[PDB]
Paper text:
O-glycosylation of the protein CST1 by the mucin-type O-glycosyltransferase T. gondii (Txg) GalNAc-T3 influences cyst wall rigidity and stability. The strict glycopeptide-preferring enzyme TxgGalNAc-T3 then adds GalNAc to acceptor Thr one position N-terminal to existing Thr-O-GalNAcs and is predicted to sequentially O-glycosylate Thr rich repeats within the mucin domain of CST1. The structures reveal a unique GalNAc binding pocket that dictates the substrate preference of TxgGalNAc-T3, which is coupled to a 2nd metal binding site that is strictly conserved among apicomplexan homologs.
To investigate the basis of the substrate specificity and function of TxgGalNAc-T3, we solved the x-ray co-crystal structures of TxgGalNAc-T3 in complex with Mn2+, a non-hydrolysable form of UDP-GalNAc (UDP-2-(acetylamino)−4-F-D-galactosamine disodium salt, UDP-GalNAc-F) and each of the following glycopeptides: CST1.4, Muc5AC-3,13, Muc5AC-3, Muc5AC-13, and SRS13.2 from 2.2-2.9 Å resolution. Although the glycopeptide amino acid sequences vary, both CST1.4 and Muc5AC-3,13 are similarly bound along the active site substrate groove with the acceptor Thr positioned for catalysis, adopting a similar conformation seen in peptides bound to metazoan GalNAc-Ts. Poor electron density for the remaining unmodeled residues in CST1.4 and Muc5AC-3,13 suggests that they are disordered in the structure and making transient interactions with TxgGalNAc-T3. It is notable that the di-glycopeptides were the only substrates with electron density for the N-terminal portion of the peptide chain, but it is not clear what is stabilizing the peptide conformations in these structures since we did not observe density for the C-terminal residues. Thr-O-GalNAc at the +1 position on the glycopeptides is bound to a pocket in TxgGalNAc-T3 consisting of His333 (catalytic domain) and Glu554 (lectin domain) that interact with GalNAc via sidechain H-bonds, and Ser334 (catalytic domain), which interacts with GalNAc through a mainchain H-bond. We observed density that appears to be a 2nd metal (Mn2+N) near the GalNAc binding pocket, a striking and unexpected feature not previously seen in metazoan GalNAc-Ts. Mn2+N is coupled to the GalNAc binding pocket through coordination to His333 and indirect coordination to Glu554 via water. Glu336 and 2 additional waters complete the coordination sphere of Mn2+N, which adopts an irregular octahedral geometry. Loop II flexibility and the interaction that occurs between the Gly319 backbone carbonyl and an amide group on both di-glycopeptide substrates (Muc5AC-3,13 and CST1.4) allows TxgGalNAc-T3 to accommodate and modify substrates with variable sequences.
Residue numbers in the entry:
A (entry chain B): 1 to 6
B (entry chain A): 102 to 628
Amino acid sequence: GTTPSP
Amino acid sequence: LEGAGPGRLHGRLGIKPDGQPGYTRAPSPPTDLSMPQALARGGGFNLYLSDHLELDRTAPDARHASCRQLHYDLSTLPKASVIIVFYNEPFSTLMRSVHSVLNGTPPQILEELILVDDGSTLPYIREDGNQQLVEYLKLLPAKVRLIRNEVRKGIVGARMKGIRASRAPIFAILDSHIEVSPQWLEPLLLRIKEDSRRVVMPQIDGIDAETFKHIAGGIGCKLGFLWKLMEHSYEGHQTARLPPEERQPSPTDFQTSPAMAGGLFAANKAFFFDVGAYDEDFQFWGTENLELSFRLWQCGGVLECAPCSRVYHIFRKGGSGYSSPGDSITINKMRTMLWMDEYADLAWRVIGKPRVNYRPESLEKRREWRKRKGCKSFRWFMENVFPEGDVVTLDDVPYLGPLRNDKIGMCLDNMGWASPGHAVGLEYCHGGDTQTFMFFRKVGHVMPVNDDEACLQPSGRLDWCRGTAQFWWDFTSSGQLMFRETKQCLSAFGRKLRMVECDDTDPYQIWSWTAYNPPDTFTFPSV
Ligand SMILES: O=c1ccn([C@@H]2O[C@H](COP(=O)(O)OP(=O)(O)O)[C@@H](O)[C@H]2O)c(=O)[nH]1
Ligand SMILES: *[C@H]1O[C@H](CO)[C@H](O)[C@H](O)[C@H]1NC(C)=O
Ligand SMILES: [Mn+2]
Ligand SMILES: [Mn+2]
């Protein structure tokens, strides 16, 4: 699914 | 409802007539809990903890201080419809989302709160089950309305159902597992009020899937995309390419974005249908956010991010809340390639030259719509909307193909994993994607075609791509793969990749790389 920004 | 005030803007929610809560909080999670097991039970987050946490859960104000110094005249702002779709979302997470919106949204600007059951199978959600949801909704305001999809249609199918039922001039879509920061809707309504062509999205914050802590910083304002067809936040070397007046923007200024994260945005209802709404042949979970974003810009719309509109979101970790067919994500990407014009050649190769049933008949009807609308090209999109990308024109991908060394007669091989973190090998050439690499000249990156986040390194391995000198290669006129920093060349001596002093006379450091001379028009694959 969508993943957060590093 | 009664008891309204700061923190409970619609009154005290979920209270039986006896003064008792209609929802019993679970005891604290068991002490001996294997998080991987629990993450796989709750569908990517710890359900034990969620069921223990209150629905009226206080959240830290993630907004910058300067965002709180702004005032809004709720009487002049248009009312909006909040749409939360869900498939088998747990009660605790779904109602916490509801309570968060109702408690945090002024009633003067909330026309309704539409809940869309995308064909859920859980007993608490079913109309042939224990009726927990329907019963608890009676304890909520009448603004909250539950509509149901007879059969699981997917994200696009559920959102369209909620949008077509919404009665406000503006609608706002939100995931079924969120927690809002204060004054989240007001800044979005003000933007859309001044221009109905603006699609405005909040800045997404985090709720840890394991601990449920609030993490400031989820998905920023400026984000582009990967050639795997996936939203990707701007990286440092990319924000550096921005105009000097846009690199450190004000905390409150609205910033345009080439793409959105998906499913947390607000828009004028009428404009949304005039600019294409959603492509309803999309299936289940997928890349509708990129199909919308490209079409939005190309057909006379503007996508921007409201830094003062913050919403917390549970990013799923170690599990998935539902199972979608495997061919759906592939189909949605094929349909998205209609809007990428000639650039679809690169995207098609990166996702593996697939050949699925992308419903060609339906996609043709949208190619017509795109023409009758006068939409602009993806070249225009890259040169005007996302000019900070590593590939603005396909001339930024000069090489795409095998990296062969004729001395040993072998090709570089990703060895079965284009994912970062593994060594590259040397194998006899066979002409499969496992041995095809691409070059991005703007950044000197050598990647496997199937992952533009994996970059070759002088260590002979692949690692996460970064726009630094740690990943900058030069492909010389002699055919040498030179690493700029160390000024050494890559050799295949002894079927082992090693760095050596550059010497065009050394055949073991001479490589051949097929030139990427794509066509001018992408012909979709036959179905
Ligand atoms: O077939 C589906 C799949 C998802 N969803 C809902 O769409 C939203 C977005 O899905 P998800 O949160 O899994 O996306 P992610 O944020 O994980 O990328 C959630 O509220 C899901 O419950 C839905 O209604 N139907
Ligand atoms: C989240 O992480 C994945 C890792 O593969 C991708 O890099 C994706 O682009 C990321 N999403 C965002 C919003 O940057
Ligand atoms: Mn989500
Ligand atoms: Mn990156």
